[PDB]
Amino acid sequence: EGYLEILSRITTEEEFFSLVLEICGNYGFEFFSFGARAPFPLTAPKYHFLSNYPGEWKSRYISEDYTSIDPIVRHGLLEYTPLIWRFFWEEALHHGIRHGWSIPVRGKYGLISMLSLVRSSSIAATEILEKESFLLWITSMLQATFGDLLAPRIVPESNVRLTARETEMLKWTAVGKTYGEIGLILSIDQRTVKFHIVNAMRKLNSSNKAEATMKAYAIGLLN
Amino acid sequence: REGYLEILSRITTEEEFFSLVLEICGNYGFEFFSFGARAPFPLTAPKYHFLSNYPGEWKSRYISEDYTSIDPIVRHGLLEYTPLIWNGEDFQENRFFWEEALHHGIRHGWSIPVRGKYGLISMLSLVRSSESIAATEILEKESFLLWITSMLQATFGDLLAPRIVPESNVRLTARETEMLKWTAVGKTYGEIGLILSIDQRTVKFHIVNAMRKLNSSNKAEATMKAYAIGLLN
Ligand SMILES: CCCCCCCCCC(=O)CC(=O)N[C@H]1CCOC1=O
Ligand SMILES: CCCCCCCCCC(=O)CC(=O)N[C@H]1CCOC1=O
Numbered sequence: 178e179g180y181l182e183i184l185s186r187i188t189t190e191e192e193f194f195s196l197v198l199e200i201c202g203n204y205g206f207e208f209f210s211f212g213a214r215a216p217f218p219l220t221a222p223k224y225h226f227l228s229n230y231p232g233e234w235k236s237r238y239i240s241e242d243y244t245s246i247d248p249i250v251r252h253g254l255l256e257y258t259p260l261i262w263r264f265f266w267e268e269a270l271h272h273g274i275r276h277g278w279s280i281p282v283r284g285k286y287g288l289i290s291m292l293s294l295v296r297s298s299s300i301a302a303t304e305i306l307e308k309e310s311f312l313l314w315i316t317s318m319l320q321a322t323f324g325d326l327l328a329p330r331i332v333p334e335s336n337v338r339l340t341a342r343e344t345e346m347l348k349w350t351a352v353g354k355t356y357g358e359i360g361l362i363l364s365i366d367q368r369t370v371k372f373h374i375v376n377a378m379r380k381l382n383s384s385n386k387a388e389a390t391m392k393a394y395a396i397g398l399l400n
Numbered sequence: 401r402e403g404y405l406e407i408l409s410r411i412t413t414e415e416e417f418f419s420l421v422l423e424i425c426g427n428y429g430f431e432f433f434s435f436g437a438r439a440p441f442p443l444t445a446p447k448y449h450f451l452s453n454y455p456g457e458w459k460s461r462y463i464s465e466d467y468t469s470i471d472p473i474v475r476h477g478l479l480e481y482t483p484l485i486w487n488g489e490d491f492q493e494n495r496f497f498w499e500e501a502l503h504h505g506i507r508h509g510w511s512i513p514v515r516g517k518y519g520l521i522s523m524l525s526l527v528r529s530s531e532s533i534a535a536t537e538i539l540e541k542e543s544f545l546l547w548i549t550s551m552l553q554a555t556f557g558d559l560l561a562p563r564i565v566p567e568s569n570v571r572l573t574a575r576e577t578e579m580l581k582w583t584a585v586g587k588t589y590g591e592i593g594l595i596l597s598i599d600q601r602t603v604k605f606h607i608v609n610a611m612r613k614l615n616s617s618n619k620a621e622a623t624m625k626a627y628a629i630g631l632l633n
């Protein structure tokens with residue numbers, strides 16, 4: 178092999194863009210789509226994805242906000258297994274996107290990501306059961322680097338540090354404890370509980386303790 | 401693969417699960433193994449479920465001292481998300497931890513963390529006493545191990561979610577699911593009814609039901625429990 182060596186060197190979007198464009202081809206593919214859904218906000222999480230799909234297709238996919246209906250994408254949220262694969266489908270087919278393999282991997286900071294390698298001429302148990310275990314391997318290492326790149330812009334809270342105390346205040350808040358209940362549990366004063374929470378809210382750029390707690394959890398800060 | 405898939409669709413018991421891992425451990429050139437999963441509830445202190453064939457005196461200390469919450473390999477698995485080759489001799493901190501493991505032959509390890517359904521986080525470790533895991537042996541078994549760990553995990557997960565993740569059987573309707581999304585972010589019942597153009601009393605109706613299904617005494621608990629299980633998003 179020789180990819181961890183390329184990655185440990187890669188430090189930009191294009192370097193990632195072209196490092197996948199080569200893997201795309203070196204395994205018989207023309208289209209590639211690496212996507213990543215942030216955990217925030219909960220009510221409309223924001224995806225981020227580079228590709229090489231037809232320009233006309235990129236723009237229209239956004240236009241109608243297809244992320245909220247795309248089955249290739251819904252899978253990447255409920256299932257942890259790879260997937261060899263409505264006027265929506267019709268609108269796509271006629272662009273060169275009908276034959277492709279999507280690989281969903283969970284990553285740091287609660288990021289849910291997917292490598293969807295598509296081609297313009299399908300399934301092959303002798304090609305799948307042949308590259309199956311690699312494709313998956315590549316994907317995990319792709320997402321690792323990809324997150325280390327996106328986390329900055331995409332999950333700005335990723336470099337948040339949480340004091341021991343704040344971590345413990347957030348955990349008891351995750352379970353719905355009032356400032357008063359936490360004190361009796363921790364044998365500590367009330368203004369004390371509020372103090373630490375209020376600090377974490379700020380670092381975590383949240384309007385309130387529930388949003389904070391949720392953001393902290395969603396990122397692994399309470400793990 | 402030689403029908404691991406078949407051997408794995410059969411597995412219905414823990415001891416069955418135990419022997420598959422043990423054969424893999426042996427077949428793949430190691431000596432000890434562990435496999436465990438971390439359930440997400442309660443969020444205050446998640447519980448771990450694991451087995452190994454480590455020397456009995458280490459099993460006992462590992463459980464006694466609650467090492468799941470100290471073991472750096474476990475921290476890596478939760479916090480980063482990738483496979484890791486390690487050598488107990490190398491670590492500079494946690495010597496009280498590492499010396500004792502070195503003492504029992506737990507020196508060269510290969511660990512593969514993975515995420516699965518219901519907020520279950522799992523990890524296979526293959527370990528041996530001598531002969532370090534080198535670039536070549538990895539070049540060879542790496543992909544297979546990463547795959548078999550995905551497999552092993554879905555099993556361990558379907559095999560145990562029941563007692564491990566009690567609220568994992570829960571189903572939420574579109575409305576309950578949206579009330580929780582807005583609750584996670586701290587909206588009140590009044591704000592949610594305005595936001596969705598439905599009566600406050602109905603917002604309440606659905607959250608109360610969502611609370612009862614997820615066995616929570618408060619909407620905040622319910623929301624977070626729902627989140628961890630993948631019910632939201
Ligand atoms: C892991 C959950 C999704 C993370 C974000 C992915 C966004 C990428 C959107 C996308 O292009 C989906 C995709 O690859 N499907 C193709 C196939 C047919 O029509 C498409 O747009
Ligand atoms: C992140 C998911 C973790 C799943 C829980 C698995 C618990 C089993 C922990 C374990 O025994 C790992 C391990 O082998 N640690 C080694 C390292 C040195 O001493 C050990 O016991």
Ligand code: NA
Binds near residue numbers: 225226227
């Ligand atoms: Na982007």
